[PDB]
Every structure is written in C-alpha cells, then in structure tokens.
Design an enzyme around this catalytic site. Structure first.
Site, PDB file in Angstrom:
ATOM      1  N   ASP A   1      53.519   4.135 -43.668  1.00  0.00           N
ATOM      2  CA  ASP A   1      54.201   5.142 -42.922  1.00  0.00           C
ATOM      3  C   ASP A   1      54.625   6.370 -43.815  1.00  0.00           C
ATOM      4  OD1 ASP A   1      57.490   3.597 -42.168  1.00  0.00           O
ATOM      5  OD2 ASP A   1      56.463   4.338 -43.976  1.00  0.00           O
TER       6      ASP A   1
ATOM      7  N   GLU B   1      54.295   8.318 -32.625  1.00  0.00           N
ATOM      8  CA  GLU B   1      53.857   7.320 -33.600  1.00  0.00           C
ATOM      9  C   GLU B   1      52.367   7.161 -33.889  1.00  0.00           C
ATOM     10  OE1 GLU B   1      57.669   6.023 -34.747  1.00  0.00           O
ATOM     11  OE2 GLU B   1      55.693   5.966 -35.728  1.00  0.00           O
TER      12      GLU B   1
END
Ligand SMILES: [Cl-]
EC number: 3.2.1.17
Length: 162
Positions: A20, A11
């Site tokens: 994202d 991540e």
C-alpha cells in the site's frame, strides 16, 4: 453511488499481493494483510484469511468476499465506537458514507482521534470541519483521496466521485 462503489474507487482492485501507500502488504480492495515486512507472513495471513493455500493470488470472488466483510466491519466499528456513534447518528446518508470511508481506511481508533473535526461535524459546521480535517497527516499523505472525503463532508453530495 454508495459505500461499496465509493470505496472501490478509492482503493482499486488487485488480485495479487501488493504494497500500500505506506508500504504494507495488502490484497483485493484495500484489504491490509500485515504491517510486517515479511512476504511470508503476508502470505500466511492471506491463506488464513481465504481458507486455502493461495500462493499470494486470489480470485475476484474472493476479493469481493473480503471486501464485504471489511465494509461490514467498518460500519459496525462506526456504530460501536463511543466517540463515533453519536456523530454517525447525527449525520445524513451521504455523510455517513464519508465517515465509514475513513474507518475503513484508518481504523475506528484512527478516526475516534479527530476530536475537533468530529465535534464540528456533529455541530453541522461543514466549512469549519473541512478546514480542520485538512490539517492532518492523512491529508498530507494522501491528498487526493482525502480531498474526496472532505468535499463529501462539506457538501453532503457525491459530486467528488463523479
Ligand atoms: Cl479476515
């Protein structure tokens, strides 16, 4: 290696709001804030999350506090979901980590959907589940991360993360 480290690799860490891979508002260590296109809303979800007027910036500590809660909730979604529990319970330690990774990323509900793959894992049919897992949008959108999770399930070791 462990769940936190693993997830930290997949991540990254960002102290300022970001978009994202799917274009949604996120912060920290893959902490999704909202799926709405409003930066306002995101700021709001953030402040609410942190308990302060953040201005879209947080500290490391704060990032980590969110990460912790997030990893904790994903574990629990694994034990809680009815399609999940059984598989989870049948797995070894490394492979459990692989499953949680997926829950964090796609929700309990996203994962509960990989029926055929879930049964194969449960049957400890590694090579088949791996092929099957690869026939997915998941795999096609985020191929490198997916490959990582997939080998983990295949091999039951941390080699992909070294
Ligand atoms: Cl929260």
């Amino acid at each position: 290696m462990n769940i936190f480290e693993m997830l930290r690799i997949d991540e990254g860490l960002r102290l300022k709001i970001y978009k994202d891979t799917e274009g949604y508002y996120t912060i920290g260590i893959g902490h999704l804030l909202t799926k709405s296109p409003s930066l306002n809303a995101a700021k709001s979800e953030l402040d609410k999350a942190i308990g302060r007027n953040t201005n879209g910036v947080i500290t490391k500590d704060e990032a980590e506090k969110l990460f912790n809660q997030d990893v904790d909730a994903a574990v629990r979604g694994a034990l809680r979901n009815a399609k999940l529990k059984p598989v989870y319970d049948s797995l070894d330690a490394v492979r459990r980590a692989a499953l949680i990774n997926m829950v964090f990323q796609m929700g309990e509900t996203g994962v509960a959907g990989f029926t055929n793959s879930l049964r194969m894992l449960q049957q400890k049919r590694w090579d088949e589940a791996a092929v099957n897992l690869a026939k997915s949008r998941w795999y096609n959108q985020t191929p490198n991360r997916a490959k990582r999770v997939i080998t983990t399930f295949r091999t039951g070791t941390w080699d992909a993360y070294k």
